Amino acid sequence: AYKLVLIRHGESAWNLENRFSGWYDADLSPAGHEEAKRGGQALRDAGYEFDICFTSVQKRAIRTLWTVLDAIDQMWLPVVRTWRLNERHYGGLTGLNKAETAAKHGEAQVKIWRRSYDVPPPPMEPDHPFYSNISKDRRYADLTEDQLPSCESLKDTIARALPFWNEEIVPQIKEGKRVLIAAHGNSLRGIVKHLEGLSEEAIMELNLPTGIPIVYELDKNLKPIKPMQFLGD
Amino acid sequence: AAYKLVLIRHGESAWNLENRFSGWYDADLSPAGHEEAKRGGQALRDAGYEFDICFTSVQKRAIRTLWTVLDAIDQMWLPVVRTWRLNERHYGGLTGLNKAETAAKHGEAQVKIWRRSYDVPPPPMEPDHPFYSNISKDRRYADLTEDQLPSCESLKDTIARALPFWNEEIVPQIKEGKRVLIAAHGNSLRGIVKHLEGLSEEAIMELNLPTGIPIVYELDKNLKPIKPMQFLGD
Numbered sequence: 215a216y217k218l219v220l221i222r223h224g225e226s227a228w229n230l231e232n233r234f235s236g237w238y239d240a241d242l243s244p245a246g247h248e249e250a251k252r253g254g255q256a257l258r259d260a261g262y263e264f265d266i267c268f269t270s271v272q273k274r275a276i277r278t279l280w281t282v283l284d285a286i287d288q289m290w291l292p293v294v295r296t297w298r299l300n301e302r303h304y305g306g307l308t309g310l311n312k313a314e315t316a317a318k319h320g321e322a323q324v325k326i327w328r329r330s331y332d333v334p335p336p337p338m339e340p341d342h343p344f345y346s347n348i349s350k351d352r353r354y355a356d357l358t359e360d361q362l363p364s365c366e367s368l369k370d371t372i373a374r375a376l377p378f379w380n381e382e383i384v385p386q387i388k389e390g391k392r393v394l395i396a397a398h399g400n401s402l403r404g405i406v407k408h409l410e411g412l413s414e415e416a417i418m419e420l421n422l423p424t425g426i427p428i429v430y431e432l433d434k435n436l437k438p439i440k441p442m443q444f445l446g447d
Numbered sequence: 448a449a450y451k452l453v454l455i456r457h458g459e460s461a462w463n464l465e466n467r468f469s470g471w472y473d474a475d476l477s478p479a480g481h482e483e484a485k486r487g488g489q490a491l492r493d494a495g496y497e498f499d500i501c502f503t504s505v506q507k508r509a510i511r512t513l514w515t516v517l518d519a520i521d522q523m524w525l526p527v528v529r530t531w532r533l534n535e536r537h538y539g540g541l542t543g544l545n546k547a548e549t550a551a552k553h554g555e556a557q558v559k560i561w562r563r564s565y566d567v568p569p570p571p572m573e574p575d576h577p578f579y580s581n582i583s584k585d586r587r588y589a590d591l592t593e594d595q596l597p598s599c600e601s602l603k604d605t606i607a608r609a610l611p612f613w614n615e616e617i618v619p620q621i622k623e624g625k626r627v628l629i630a631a632h633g634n635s636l637r638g639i640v641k642h643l644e645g646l647s648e649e650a651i652m653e654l655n656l657p658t659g660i661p662i663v664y665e666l667d668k669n670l671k672p673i674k675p676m677q678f679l680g681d
């Protein structure tokens with residue numbers, strides 16, 4: 215059967231994973247970097263080989279991929295980057311911790327955003343410290359005005375990840391290419407949702423572990439033949 | 448000028464230290480080599496350089512150099528294209544041997560001939576060579592045709608398989624207005640510099656490109672340099 219591996223990057227700098235890092239291009243913390251090395255060794259020890267790699271345009275995922283490729287001696291593999299595998303864009307909340315979020319928007323609204331599949335946070339306004347840093351970053355310059363999010367619901371995030379999966383990743387899998395995907399919790403959520411045909415409520419409950427190879431065994435229809443599996447101990 | 452092109456030769460490798468012929472052997476950077484690539488990156492960063500696409504070989508000394516550069520300039524998001532065609536010259540049976548071993552087996556004279564010759568290849572790497580499997584059977588070359596997978600190369604051979612990539616994959620990008628970074632190897636970059644400046648065989652063999660230093664070209668719309676290559680740094 216086809217074999218697919220996913221890896222979610224680990225910790226980013228300045229505690230930004232607990233601060234709605236979203237589309238801000240936070241680097242890995244040294245610890246986050248160590249997780250990626252540990253995961254790389256798991257794959258080396260297991261003798262995994264890949265033919266193509268997919269990642270986002272965010273450095274925390276890219277450096278995670280680099281760390282894995284280094285560890286398994288396949289730095290020579292072709293690599294494809296796409297904004298479509300970016301983390302969820304958290305709009306105005308980006309960079310705020312939990313207390314600052316509650317203080318600014320209230321517990322009632324924050325709880326609603328947290329449990330909703332289709333409600334976006336408020337948009338990142340020009341007064342936001344990250345507004346121009348992200349919205350005018352040249353890596354998004356070719357994006358149409360509607361493709362470049364000011365904010366995303368989980369639904370929005372999954373909707374823009376899947377076209378890439380369908381058009382670019384699927385064809386590779388169907389040609390027997392062994393695929394590695396290094397991305398983010400919410401973009402990975404979209405792939406896991408489509409693969410296992412999960413429900414909105416179920417995908418919002420799924421919390422993929424970080425820095426750990428996630429292995430899928432798929433049949434000819436790209437349906438999983440078993441639950442996701444993890445590498446390590 | 449209409450276009451700007453940046454080249455960089457990989458930093459010092461672990462085998463450059465041991466003074467062994469690497470060629471297609473996938474030797475990694477030495478720590479100094481990594482520091483060189485880093486300084487190259489900082490130079491590019493201080494000068495405000497921006498790229499849109501990166502080309503490199505399938506050898507990690509060039510790749511890690513590119514990685515180190517992309518890190519220094521905060522452009523890790525750029526698309527990266529890897530090709531064997533940008534690989535170091537394939538040193539055949541000399542692969543793995545050092546200076547002494549090479550002179551010992553072949554004599555100083557023969558070494559002189561190979562050194563100064565543009566089109567005379569070293570002896571072939573044969574099935575009993577200790578790095579034969581390591582290179583000739585590495586799956587990264589699985590898709591090469593029988594003719595393409597070399598047992599050895601003269602500089603001429605190297606340039607001949609490197610230029611096709613330049614003309615078909617790099618040139619169109621440049622004329623598309625994409626700012627190109629090429630992180631590769633001495634002899635593969637030699638082919639590009641030879642074509643750009645229209646150099647003679649003797650002129651190119653006399654050309655020593657420094658490890659880990661950025662080489663900048665200002666090109667006209669026909670990819671002709673308006674001025675001599677420039678190095679970047681302090």
Ligand SMILES: CC(=O)Oc1ccccc1S(=O)(=O)Nc1cc2c(c(O)c1O)C(=O)c1ccccc1C2=O
Pocket residue numbers: 466467468545546547549550558561562569
């Ligand atoms: C006897 C031998 O070649 O030793 C080695 C081994 C590694 C590096 C340098 C040497 S060296 O002292 O002889 N000097 C040295 C030797 C050589 C070259 C070169 O540029 C150089 O500077 C080549 O380009 C070269 C190209 C093709 C075949 C052989 C050589 C070669 O043999």
Ligand SMILES: [Cl-]
Pocket residue numbers: 293527
């Ligand atoms: Cl890469």
